[model samples]
Target chain A: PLIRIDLTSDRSREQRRAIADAVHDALVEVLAIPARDRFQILTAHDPSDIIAEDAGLGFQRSPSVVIIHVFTQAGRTIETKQRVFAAITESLAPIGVAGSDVFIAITENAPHDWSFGFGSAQYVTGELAIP
Target chain B: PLIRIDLTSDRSREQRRAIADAVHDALVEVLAIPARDRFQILTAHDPSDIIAEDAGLGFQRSPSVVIIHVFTQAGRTIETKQRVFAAITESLAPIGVAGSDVFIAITENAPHDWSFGFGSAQYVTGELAIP
Candidate 1:
């Protein structure tokens, strides 16, 4: 499952990293999210490149902004949202992340259960099967 | 709507097809999901590539890993979250997807809904209609 979280912000990597760390903490501590399975957080540094306004409509200007993608296990609820939001806000004390500025999208995914390696019969015969 | 799913554990076209079939069934049967609008599940094979993820994020040694992408009309509530989750989990079950590892991420995105598929309309375009 891919959860893409994009945010509008005006801060440098240092600043953003601070917020990310906080958010990461919230995911781990509150949500019981694990690091091994943590979603890769891909950051789009250039607002112009990633932030598009419809068909070149336009965007609300700011010095800097950030978008985050969180991939994780599916099954989230409204309560889960609240818990996450609380965690995010608390983690980024003083910095403050507003509801309007943050966006979250979730995707559900599953991989094959068994995978054989090198010279394995399943590898040769079934390599193309799981994807 | 792009969902990339890669499976490992060495499986061939026929065998993998069986599993995929099983999976799709479980998703719809147990999940109670809507058909009109659903996720774009992109499947990748050729274990030759796409699975490794560490240096390259060498993915878990496997047959295939299937990734999914869901772009909603926009704005989803948490309860909406539960409904969606319940639908998916219930729908895809007979496939017997285990929980050794799974990923889900919610990337909240808002297209300036006012999309100009063409170069004409917008909040100001009297000549151009909305997308």
Candidate 2:
């Protein structure tokens, strides 16, 4: 699984680590992925990276909620997916992450079905040093 | 459009800025988006973030090729999209980016059709002080 956690600067680095922990473990426990199979990225967001608006569902939206993106092989059962969600919140609860504030989007695909969306990729391609 | 750039940090920070220049300018020129409409994020990567392997089409890929993702409103014609591709390379040529190395993937959507895929956004929701 490839995971990305994008959030505001408010969270301390410590909180960030804990969040990854919750997310990773949730995936492993629910999807049965190898513990070593983890892949995740953490990015600090600008206000622009996040937009503010209530969807009129009628509730106060928390400003510090985190946004997550998961890109992995397509086809996990919805039941399994939801389990991962609940487990993540369970792990995160001690640190104050509400189930509502932990937002996630999972994108699915497989090795051959991949489109880097460009050549070389055409999505996944390449490795080297920073010059 | 909101953009996210995920590429190995092999390029110097200055190079990353130059790359952004080429990208933002192309969108403005071809899409006729406003100069002030730019929104992009640059994230450094671990080798794990990028997996190397040519797509079996016979060519040496510089591990330096970058991966880019663009999320915007749907409905641009293929002609305009191709032009953005061409313009980006043309702009980057002076800085040494090959057309192939300039990878791009564009996604489209609009306000009403949006699904955060999770509650809150269930994609876009929130704003607040970090702490």
Candidate 3:
């Protein structure tokens, strides 16, 4: 799975690494995603580039809003996803990142759709096993 | 739809904007995605952070290798996707980005899965119509 974390540019590099590690660790702990299978991208965005509203929930968000997009293989149950999200929130708690400020999107695909490198689909070619 | 482009940090800010525009225009042309619907994120990665192998194709890719992730609504035919890919390559030609250097992953989700802000699902609430 690939976790892409989009955050405000005000975040320091150390904070960025910590947040990335937090989510990656959550996926590992909850989904048993191998520690070696690290595929995470953290991007610092200008506040203007990220327009987020509070969805009429009546609560205001701090400048620490985080938008997470998880791209992975298909077949995880809804229950499993919820657990991963819970773990992510818990892992990020120590950093002062509020649960209310995080929005996660999970996008799933099949084995044939990925090509890690070269020009071939390693999963479909048997070079890489579906995990 | 949300399009995320991850590339090497060597790309200029001008190139980044051009690449982002290229893909957005391709989506509009190929899928009739409304011109107003612009949701894109571009990330620049240190060369060491991006690892690419030739997948046994025996061809080497330049540092220009690009990973493109397209997150959009489901149901477009496979042929539609191919056309979008073609249009993207064409739109980017003027900027000198090679088709062979690109990798695209399309991730689909439901309307309820998104919340632009206000902690609300505007699509389901009728605040915004699905396109």
Candidate 4:
């Protein structure tokens, strides 16, 4: 599955970079994730790219944020989620990384969720699916 | 490690398809990513969407681009990132694909770096964390 995480924050690039680095280190120390299973972390810099608010309906900004996308695999479990969440913010506190400032959005993708090569043709033909 | 790779050039749909295909194939043949684990590859296809810089960063045009998303996992060695990168470029070089026009961004995801599913949550709560 494909997981897309979007973060809403008012922090500068330096702050965002700090949080990103911390999370990277934590993922290695805590999860023991293999180097082979790498994921993509995209940082949407502008507050305007997305809309955020409570009663107000406009684009809003926060302090700092980290978007975490983990494409779901066959063997994923709940413990992994909880531990990852705990580790990210807990370790971030030292750098003034606020728990409240972070925002997250996770999306799941089955094999059919994405297509490659040509549109549905290749997907349906099973030409791209890994065996 | 959030890796951002941007490809700026001129091409068309047929070209984009050709290249994306070639790189994906090479990944399977040369790198051998597991059938279970996968990466999120994003595509942006509006020539007017991004401006090409022949000289400046003013709004410009192009054909199509494949933005690849790969988060690095640890325990993790050289075989992963380099392999995926090479595989991507090769697989995409088909279908009228332009080796020069495919843009790729590969970021590595460690554990604690991502706050669970809070901001990343699907606005829904699905579960995972398997071994």
Which candidate number would show the highest TM-score if scored against the true structure?
A: 3
Cα displacement (Å) at residue B76, model 4:
28
lDDT of 3 at A66: 86
The docking category that best describes candidate 1 is incorrect
Task: Arrange candidates by DockQ, descending.
Answer: 3, 2, 4, 1
- Model 2 interface CAPRI class: incorrect
Q: For residues B24-91, write the lDDT of model 1, one tens digit per residue.
A: 44334534433322334434333332222221123453334333333433444544444443443333
TM-score of 2: 0.50
- Please give, for residues A22-84, the per-residue lDDT of candidate 4 as tens digits: 665566565665322223333444556655443454444453444555544333467866776
Chain B: TM-scores of all predictions = 0.44, 0.76, 0.89, 0.48
Against the unseen true structure, what C-alpha lDDT does each candidate score? 0.41, 0.63, 0.75, 0.44
Assess the local accuracy of residue A107 in candidate 1 as a C-alpha lDDT between 0 and 100: 45
Task: Report the error of model 4 at residue B130, Å.
Answer: 31
- For each candidate, report its DockQ versus the true two-chain complex: 0.04, 0.09, 0.12, 0.04
Per-residue lDDT of B57 in model 1: 26
List candidate 2 stretches off by more than 4 Å: A46-49, A52-54, A113-131, B1-4, B7-11, B17-41, B44-131
Candidate 4 CAPRI level: incorrect
Write the candidate numbers in order of decreasing lDDT.
3, 2, 4, 1
Q: Give the interface RMSD values of the models in order.
A: 12.9, 8.0, 5.3, 13.7
Q: Give fnat, all candidates.
A: 0.01, 0.05, 0.06, 0.00
Q: After superposition, how far is residue A109 of candidate 2 from its true place, in Å?
A: 2.1
Question: Mind giving the per-residue lDDT tens digits that candidate 4 earns over B1-131?
Answer: 22222222465546545454455455456545443333334344234322222111122223454445444333334444444545565556545444433333333444445433356632123343321
